[PDB]
Design a protein around this ligand. Sequence first.
Ligand code: SF4
Ligand code: SF4
Ligand code: SF4
Ligand code: SF4
Ligand code: FES
Ligand SMILES: [Mg+2]
Ligand SMILES: [Zn+2]
Lengths: 690, 96, 115, 48, 125, 208, 106, 157, 86
Amino acid sequence: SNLIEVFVDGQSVMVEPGTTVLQACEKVGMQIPRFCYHERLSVAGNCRMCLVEIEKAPKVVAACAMPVMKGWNILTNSEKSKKAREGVMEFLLANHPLDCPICDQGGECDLQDQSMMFGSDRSRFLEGKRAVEDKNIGPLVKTIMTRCIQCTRCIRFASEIAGVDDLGTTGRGNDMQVGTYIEKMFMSELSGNIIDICPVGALTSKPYAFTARPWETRKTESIDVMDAVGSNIVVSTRTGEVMRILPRMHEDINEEWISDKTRFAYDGLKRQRLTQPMIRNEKGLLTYTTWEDALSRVAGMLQSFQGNDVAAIAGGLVDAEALVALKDLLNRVDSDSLCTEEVFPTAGAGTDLRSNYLLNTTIAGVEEADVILLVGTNPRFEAPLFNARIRKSWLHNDLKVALIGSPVDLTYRYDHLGDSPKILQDIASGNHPFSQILKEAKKPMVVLGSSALQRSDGTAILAAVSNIAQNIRLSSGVTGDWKVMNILHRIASQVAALDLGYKPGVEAIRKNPPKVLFLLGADGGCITRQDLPKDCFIIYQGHHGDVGAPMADVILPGAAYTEKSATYVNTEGRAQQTKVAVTPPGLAREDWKIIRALSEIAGMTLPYDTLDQVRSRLEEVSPNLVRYDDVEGANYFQQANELSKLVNQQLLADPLVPPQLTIKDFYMTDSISRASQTMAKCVKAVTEGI
Amino acid sequence: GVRTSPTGEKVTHTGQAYDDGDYRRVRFSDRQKEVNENFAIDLIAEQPVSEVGSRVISCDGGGGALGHPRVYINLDKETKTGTCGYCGLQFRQPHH
Amino acid sequence: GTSVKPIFSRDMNEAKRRVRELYRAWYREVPNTVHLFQLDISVKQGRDKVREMFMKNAHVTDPRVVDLLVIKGKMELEETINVWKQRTHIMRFFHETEAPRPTDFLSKFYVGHDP
Amino acid sequence: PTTKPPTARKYIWTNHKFNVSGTPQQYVPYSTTRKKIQEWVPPSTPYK
Amino acid sequence: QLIAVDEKLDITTLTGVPEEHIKTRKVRIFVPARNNMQSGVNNTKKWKMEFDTRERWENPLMGWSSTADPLSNLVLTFSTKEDAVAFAEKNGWSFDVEERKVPKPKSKSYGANFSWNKRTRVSTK
Amino acid sequence: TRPTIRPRNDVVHKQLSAFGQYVAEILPKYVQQVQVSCFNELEIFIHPDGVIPVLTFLRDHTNAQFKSLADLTAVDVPTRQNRFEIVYNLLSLRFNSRIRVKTYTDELTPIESSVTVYKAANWYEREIWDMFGVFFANHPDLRRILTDYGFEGHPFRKDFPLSGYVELRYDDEVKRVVAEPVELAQEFRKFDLNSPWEAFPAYRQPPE
Amino acid sequence: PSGEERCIACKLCEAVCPAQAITIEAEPRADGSRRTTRYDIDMTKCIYCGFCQEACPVDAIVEGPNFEFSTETHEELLYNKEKLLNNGDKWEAEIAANIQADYLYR
Amino acid sequence: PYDVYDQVEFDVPIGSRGDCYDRYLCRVEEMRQSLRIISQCLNKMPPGEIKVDDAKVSPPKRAEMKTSMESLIHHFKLYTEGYQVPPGATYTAIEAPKGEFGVYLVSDGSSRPYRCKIKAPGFAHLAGLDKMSKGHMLADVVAIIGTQDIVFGEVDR
Amino acid sequence: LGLREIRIHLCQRSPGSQGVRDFIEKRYVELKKANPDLPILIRECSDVQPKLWARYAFGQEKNVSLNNFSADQVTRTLENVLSGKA
Ligand code: SF4
Ligand code: SF4
Ligand code: SF4
Ligand code: SF4
Ligand code: FES
Ligand SMILES: [Mg+2]
Ligand SMILES: [Zn+2]
């Protein structure tokens, strides 16, 4: 091929042209020291720590920024490279403050470890150091700029990954500072990530400040559930208590970053917690009882009624195990009124065809598209990692973006087609020029959010989008297995519920008011006691005291997503399982365990006893759930599209306004976020700045 | 500044005090609860703010090698006073 | 292939024979141990416990594992002969002081998070 | 200390205490941190 | 001299592990993820086998953390996935194995920052 | 090489290399490898079936005569198919030298006991059986030497928990010392002290 | 000397303790200072090796010169932050004298 | 010799019968030779530092730690993580007062030893006690145990 | 006795599911025309026998294999399942 031969310490290796010296060294198996180089960020060349010697070359080159050519022999462990590294570390540590005992990055500092391995062991700096005043960029990132090494990594991240140009370098020479030059809060859905990239303790986590040390903590690899992206996380705990949340690398979902809500809303896991079962007393107030009493009352009420009189509503943070257990329990009493808070149009294919409600192109496959159409969606606050992927493809692949909806700020330039849903029909009709501009697109892509489906036009909007996709496929031809049509979800439990046969939306409850209602973590406020019959029985089974708790008759304390090994399906249809980091507080138990115990008390004993048996039941109900990294699936666009042409509901003259209009609406979305002091601080800071 | 709990115990400088319903209080009957009377926050809040005429000031806690590691504090911000990270002493430029 | 070096038995018959000899020795020794250590149990209880401990390893189908278990049992019997143990070591086989852990789902659900 | 007294500080005890084991003044250990998890407080108003 | 027996290896009955710590535990075989606070990759070379987390409670006296299970602090290191799987099968532990994740090759060019027409132009450096 | 670096001796290195080649030439049936460390320590890796012959040679040959058995121990490496590694350390007083012989075994494969060669090995062998579970054939009496009577499991294996499985206390209802499942008031804090940024490039491994 | 405790919750003494006898929990104080909320030393686990007092970068934890502190019960040998601060306030005179006498050898 | 022993002169007592009396006389003469070596060490004390001037292995001085950045970093890393030992296995033996005391140390390259086997002479001596107490009175066993110089801390480990 | 839902598990790349796939790609939409309220879930297996699951009232479920079934065979057993005859 076009691969060229380069030598590292006399060992030959093939590298594609354009590969830097650092990448060749990684290919051989060695890691060049670095401070400013980040693979996901543009090359800077500031820190000069990656200086390496090329054989028969009198000058030391920067391995991060120097493309390699045929014949070079990279002498990484040569005397010249070692001396260069020692000099660079000496210059870096000349003005660094002696803050290691009080620094929040004590045992996880790149400066410390690289000084230990590649630097010297003493100082000949006999002068006084410098000191710069601290900056204030909000209540999330604690800023101590005396420790800054001026690697300009946060600046590059903000400019490219986050699309926010707030950060910059002011001044010249030794006293050049990194900051905003004004009293401004660096606010974005990806603001916290600058803590991770910053190699030193200049930028640290404010809520996590002075709490723990890295060697103390235990790392548990789990899945984030605050959004439908399903970004992988590492829960860092210490003596049975969650200390912090860190991003985990996955090149196909979240790369290496996580959203602010994912990162800083773990605090809500320590407030408003449901710890014991509660029942209504003679006076009508909630009082603590034992598991036996509450289970007996619920089982008696479940035995007394039967059929459509019983019902269940699934929340936005429920796992597949609990969903299938509750489905089995309500099937043993001959019921099918199983509903979720988010609605999905059931006209036509509905939920029978899996490809009808998924992000078929996938987050990884976003990078291959050339045009994209967003319909009634605000991906910045509904799926921040999806928006980050779109921004990365826009910056690198020159992708073209168009949005139909309110002119929200997406951190990149797009084409505002309009507001009214009628434009969709226009795009289907062919009068709009955007139909033409997307006709030539080799890999077009259409994304429709669940926010546009929550309104009464869900069926008609979905039909119009499917018609647009059909026009794309028929006119431009079948490019391959491209899977133009996409749908982006907002809650983590929606896809898993839909795969299990849950009926989307709460319309069934309204049509047939039940006598006993199961609230499996339903805190959306969709169903109140006004639209239910009198003396109705409400069972709430969750982990937080929220809008759904005070209206209940029996409260069963469940477990949070960090307290159970549970399966969640993200918006691409990929199923991932979390791991137990801590145990549920007080008398709270696992959700599926609660359902099984209630079933056995009521006499309708469920077949499964352990987690493996519940997952076997999940495999029986759905084959896809057991696979834990598979995302591929069959393309059944034709069948769903043909079934969607029967009903002809019309669009109303209401503009597509997403709920997430402004950053102030992004912080508090679910029960965990509403119970977090950090999220309240963020909302207060965004509303009024100092 | 040692306060008293509503039950009657003394509150530690960390704010710890068993509430009315806690059974662990029984460990103190016929005995005493060990509490340090001198609170570090109150003792350091009454220290005078040092007035120096330099932009950057060095602090080692007093005593040289018997103090804390030497650090440098910047006093450009005239709104507040620079505070030592270890010792907690305050420094300020001569305004007006 | 899967050729391995033997310990004492070439096949399962010899291992079964050694198990039988070890059982004979333990059965013969139980009453002497009960009398000598001044146990509160009867000879019937001791023989039942020996039978239970032998049947605990009834699913082993590897002659090497079987005769290694036989070696361990012979070592323990020799330990019991020479009064190298005491009453506590002998009585640790009965767990008279440990609470009985439940088995059904509901009890384990009530006590704690243990599956 | 008569020849050269120790340095005087405001936090140094002015009254030395001997060993107080087996005495109503003995030291009783206890946890110093606050509560970790806060439980939900049910409302005092009936739902109906 | 050689038995030449054909059966899977099983040393469950010789390790002395209690029965409740054999058929109830669920081990995990994985390559530990890189700590996002650091750019070093030297801790993601070997495979790790670790047991599932169990209950920890606060000590009634002195507030310490107490654990009732012995295997909580145990962690084992294996050169390859096959060796760890073989160990787990030999000791009779049910295991969950996750494929190693390696960052994909990325093409980085210094020239892109000063682009004439493409959007990769940097606003500042 | 300034006074902070340990001085290197080359004559001893050459002598040990020559003797390793000599030994490997004499016993090509059993020796699988010979190594000399940077600090002048010679080690010989042999087949398990050659424990009795090779040792005997090193004890009786006019040129070796390694009379004393300094130490005998085992090393557990769970990532290997042959789990346990047996190490013999021999001291020759006539030539003022030391040698090491290394052998491999697993849980079920026995190793021939070297009590006939060195009497000192006797207790050492028992210790191995007490700590790792390696069975030694033709031993005068093989039994536990260090653990409590009736102790279940071999503590020195890498998969054995640090605190064990049972703990002892005194019960007044039965008026005796009883064993219970272990429960710690404070759990042993595990520290992740190992760090990225490898320190020794000379030991770097191929990226397979 | 101003009266503020020297400890800054760097957790070096906890990490260096061979017997794991030190337990530390910390959080920002009311004025934002880095201070401990819990500092426990188990005197029945401590081996009196002195690693804690030599790993401390601010001379916060010291191993005093008192040795007559026997106890009639096990519980009173589990020191918390209040007891250690009381010990410091009680022995500061001769502790500081010994530190002054010996700090040139360290 | 390991440290400065090849630089001190002393005599090595040797028995002639192998009984308890000869070993007692040998121990007394070893005490006298220890006094000789102590005198030589007192007379020939050199000046200089007391630990290797390698801050990546030995912690720096307190003043250097509190004034220098590299010293503070190295103190932090040495007292939190420790120093990494290159991979390898060694057997180091010295002439402890009870005989040859040895340690077989195996390091995998980290800051924690992979294996540390301890060879104590008491183990072998107590193993040979059975041979050495053949055809002797009951009261002779106590004398033989005493002359073996048995401390069970090293025997049991 | 009342059917509540049906599920069809088919393997995307296996040849044993081949004919079953054709079934959908030819007539599933028509089937959905005849049953506008019956839920017919469709899921993908992996190296597993193609199967059809039928759920009746009160949680009773019965499964039938679909290996190497032609389109006619699978549609025939489907009409047998919905028609109630056995
Ligand atoms: S940034 Fe690193 S080197 Fe600087 S004080 Fe913090 S831990 Fe120490
Ligand atoms: S704050 Fe951190 S990331 Fe930003 S320039 Fe300074 S060291 Fe680099
Ligand atoms: S002296 Fe005690 S508390 Fe200090 S490090 Fe040693 S064992 Fe730990
Ligand atoms: S006592 Fe010293 S070493 Fe321990 S945490 Fe406090 S400052 Fe750090
Ligand atoms: S890593 Fe290349 S110059 Fe900084
Ligand atoms: Mg940082
Ligand atoms: Zn200070």
